[PDB]
């Protein structure tokens, strides 16, 4: 059944939360409405090495998923991204495979610590950017996109301000995307097997 989430669901270190394909929305009074209003609460808080899987986040999506360290996100669908889809709050590696993200006013993925994010076999439509490293920071984030299909991007698929962050987009279909990468020093971008459509 759709659950209205009132308080953030914590997923302890190394554990999985399987939503079994069920929908989870935020309570707008306790977590946030999914607007651009700053610092809304995550619907899911993942501890290091935790996994979230087979979950549908519906609107109001507040500030989606935060990961404190490594997290694997498998077949999770953001039907309408709130403030952000998933944020990396502490250093680590985010791995996404499968799922989808729609209607993100600005970013789907926000990386707020040094780390990696691999996004595989993901559908994302009508978004500002797929991954933004927190603005101005100069720590290294490795951004990697494989076998995705990304469309109607306001700004860029991958965006950074750090001269050590790397961006890799491989075998991805994309449409109405202004730039693939934005802000990387020359030599810090890789791309192959992509298709503009
Ligand atoms: Ca939205």
TrEMBL record:
The keyword Calcium applies. Keywords: Calcium, Lyase, Metal-binding. Ca(2+) binds at residues 80-81, 103. This is Pectate lyase. It comes from Bacillus sp.
């Amino acid at each position: 059944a759709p659950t209205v989430v009132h308080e953030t669901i914590r997923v302890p270190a190394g554990q999985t939360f399987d939503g079994k394909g069920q929908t989870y929305v935020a309570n707008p009074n306790t977590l946030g409405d999914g607007s651009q209003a700053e610092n809304q609460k995550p619907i899911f808080r993942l501890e290091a090495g935790a996994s979230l899987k087979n979950v549908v986040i519906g609107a109001p999506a507040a500030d989606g998923v935060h990961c404190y360290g490594d997290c694997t996100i498998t077949n999770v669908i953001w039907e309408d991204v709130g403030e952000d889809a998933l944020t990396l709050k502490s250093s680590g590696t985010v791995n996404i495979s499968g799922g989808a993200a729609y209607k993100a006013y600005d970013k789907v993925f926000q990386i707020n610590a040094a780390g990696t994010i691999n996004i595989r076999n993901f559908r994302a439509d009508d978004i500002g950017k797929l991954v933004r490293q927190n603005g101005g920071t100069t720590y290294k984030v490795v951004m990697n996109v494989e076998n995705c299909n990304i469309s109607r991007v306001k700004d860029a698929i991958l965006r950074t301000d750090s001269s050590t962050s790397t961006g890799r987009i491989v075998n991805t279909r994309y449409s109405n995307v202004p730039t693939l990468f934005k802000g990387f020093k020359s030599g810090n971008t890789t791309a192959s097997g992509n298709t503009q459509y």
